Amino acid sequence: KNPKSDKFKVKRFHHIEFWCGDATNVARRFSWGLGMRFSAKSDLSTGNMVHASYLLTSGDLRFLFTAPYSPSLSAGEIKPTTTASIPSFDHGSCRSFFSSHGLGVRAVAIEVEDAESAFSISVANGAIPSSPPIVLNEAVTIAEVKLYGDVVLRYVSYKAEFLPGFERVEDASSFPLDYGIRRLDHAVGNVPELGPALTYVAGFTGFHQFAEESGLNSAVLASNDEMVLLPINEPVHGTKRKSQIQTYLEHNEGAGLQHLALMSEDIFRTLREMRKRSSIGGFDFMPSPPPTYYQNLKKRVGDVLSDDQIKECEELGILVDRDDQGTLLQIFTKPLGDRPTIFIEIIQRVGCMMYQSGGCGGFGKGNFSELFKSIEEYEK
Amino acid sequence: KNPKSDKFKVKRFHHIEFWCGDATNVARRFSWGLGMRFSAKSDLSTGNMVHASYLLTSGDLRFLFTAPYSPSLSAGEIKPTTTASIPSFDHGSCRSFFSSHGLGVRAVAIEVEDAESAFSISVANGAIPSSPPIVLNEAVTIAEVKLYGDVVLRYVSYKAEFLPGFERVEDASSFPLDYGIRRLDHAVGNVPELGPALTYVAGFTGFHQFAEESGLNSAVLASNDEMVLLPINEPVHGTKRKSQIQTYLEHNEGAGLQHLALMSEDIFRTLREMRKRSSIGGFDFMPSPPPTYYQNLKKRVGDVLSDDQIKECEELGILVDRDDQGTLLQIFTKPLGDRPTIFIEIIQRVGCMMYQSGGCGGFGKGNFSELFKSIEEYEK
Ligand SMILES: CS(=O)(=O)c1ccc(C(=O)[C@H]2C(=O)[C@@H]3CC[C@@H](C3)[C@@H]2O)c(Cl)c1
Ligand SMILES: CS(=O)(=O)c1ccc(C(=O)[C@H]2C(=O)[C@@H]3CC[C@@H](C3)[C@@H]2O)c(Cl)c1
Ligand SMILES: [Co+2]
Ligand SMILES: [Co+2]
């Protein structure tokens, strides 16, 4: 069931913003590891004396990396005279966020019809305000409310190129890398208590619940067309193996964004390219499932994937799950930075062709059992 | 003249330590950009609950990247029970350093005969103590004194593999990159006042002055065999173009390390490999000199480099200088991170063959005039 209860018009995920100590080094690492090109900048060279912000893109996926300069460079500014291009930025908030949580996601941004209306309706329905609607160059409106922990949900709306004050990047610094990633599929938060987090977020958005030991309980919130997807996890205590959700909360100093799932139009090519680069500056992947997992795929998805395609999954360590509507291929990176907190998922979905419906095939919850069974039966 | 006045036995540069917000991302970027391999680690996986430290090597060059974890992970520890592998590390100091200066060098480390003797003699001769001698696993002694700003000179001495508590890296995570870099040639500091900085450092080391508008004044301190080389710069005010030393001091919030010069055994190969990677996660280089600079090289160094070798310098943007003893080839990167502060120099020296004497060919001061002349005569 989908009551289509969104309290304001939501379009698609727009961008993800990482708060960094040094934006240059994180952005360069991510560009090479994920195949994203440098597409826009706001920094000293563009007149921004407050923060350095670099935008990477791959298809519709937008990753923004931001770090503060010395406050001394902008000590004479006030908000009405700021040279910041993101008016919600604050030196103290950014430094506090990074000292507390390490490298991670500050903003999950969605494009909406009217960011001021979305902010007003959200706050009227219980959202904790974080940054009020600000109109940039009479062209783009941006506003922010608290999502969970120190993560904000950022609303962006456009009258009619990322944000005013950003400049497109010099051709020579813009190498056209592309490993096949095309958009953000979902963004997942870890919280101490799932119930209160769901009630809060669904309360102010009108997002509905998307239709679905482990060490976790989870639920997924979704917009009207189910293209904005926000799963949330809580830990389950007292399990044999300690909950990875609880480990996250300890190392992150509380709730925050756990993973970003990036849709690829060719997951085989994406994983070939990313794995070639794992040990030369890119991203590492979690240990691959044993061969028994891939033998068991024939009975599970032999009507969807050929043997050669199953063998390709095995060569790349790709996992496969299926619900009643479609099939998904997925794989997980090791943590993106020093702490065992945020990681990336690469996903591609098969089925639900109408365009493809959001969330086609689910989120891979069936792979908790299948991985487990595989490992025990591989002990053999 | 070389009075050989070192107050303790100094061997060679040992390592450079960067203090980072996220050590993983900086280390991965530097590994790919410079061709350095991952060789050692001290982090959660090795039992270190305090800091994450990753060692890259190329030949004898050792770059260490360190960032703090959440203090909560080590809140029950005291110094006598620490899980830190570098006992001088402090969460507050590291966070303060990074918030103040951004990504940069915390420690210039030299290997000495006896780190406790070096510390004691240094402090008896005016060095400001930073971390007292600590013996690690009865095998390695480490001590630190203030050099300039928040940069320390670190003494390391070995009884007889980087440091105890570090583990060698998994073969699969250790890709054998190598672009030809072999050792640290010199490390350069920027200070507000050159005179007092020289008197302080030469006072406690016994290092001697190495034998030698612009916007700077400089002088070089050197150990007995002139293999440890520490140039220091101060700004010159009131010049037409504002001093780049003063820009550094403003953006860095004071004195600190300006550049690291890395010797290559094949500067042509190093620059081919680094330039191939500039726009795919590596390092950018400063704008190349105009063709008039390379025409003028024939009269300056035509007895040292062939025409083809001069053309190779031109293809790669390499600069050339010469003194009375030898010739040097050099080139400079753009800043390594967000702020216009620290950068890298790649160098290779020709001549002074006895082994090669330290500092053979100088430091390129003659290139301030030659670049200037080149640009004016290229206006032509
Ligand atoms: C094969 S598996 O390694 O056990 C495995 C399988 C699927 C995932 C996900 O992507 C998750 C989500 O997206 C939603 C949030 C909680 C649920 C749903 C999942 O855990 C992960 Cl993290 C690990
Ligand atoms: C051709 S140039 O771009 O004008 C140019 C040429 C040489 C250098 C150096 O390496 C320096 C040093 O190593 C020592 C410290 C101050 C002196 C000596 C130099 O400035 C630099 Cl930074 C830029
Ligand atoms: Co997922
Ligand atoms: Co130099």
Curated annotation (Swiss-Prot), chains A, B:
Residues 12-158, 183-334 form the VOC domain. One of its GO terms (cellular component) is cytoplasm. Its EC number is 1.13.11.27. Signal peptide: none annotated. Fe cation binds at H186, H259, E345. Pathway: Amino-acid degradation; L-phenylalanine degradation; acetoacetate and fumarate from L-phenylalanine: step 3/6; Cofactor biosynthesis; prenylquinone biosynthesis. Keywords: Cytoplasm, Dioxygenase, Iron, Metal-binding, Oxidoreductase, Phenylalanine catabolism, Repeat, Tyrosine catabolism. GO terms for biological process: L-phenylalanine catabolic process; tyrosine catabolic process. Its cofactor is Fe cation. It is found in: Cytoplasm. Binds 1 Fe cation per subunit. It is an enzyme of class 1 (oxidoreductase). It catalyses: 3-(4-hydroxyphenyl)pyruvate + O2 = homogentisate + CO2. The keyword Metal-binding applies. One of its GO terms (molecular function) is 4-hydroxyphenylpyruvate dioxygenase activity. PROSITE patterns: VOC. Belongs to the 4HPPD family. Homodimer. Catalyzes the conversion of 4-hydroxyphenylpyruvic acid to homogentisic acid, one of the steps in tyrosine catabolism. This is 4-hydroxyphenylpyruvate dioxygenase.
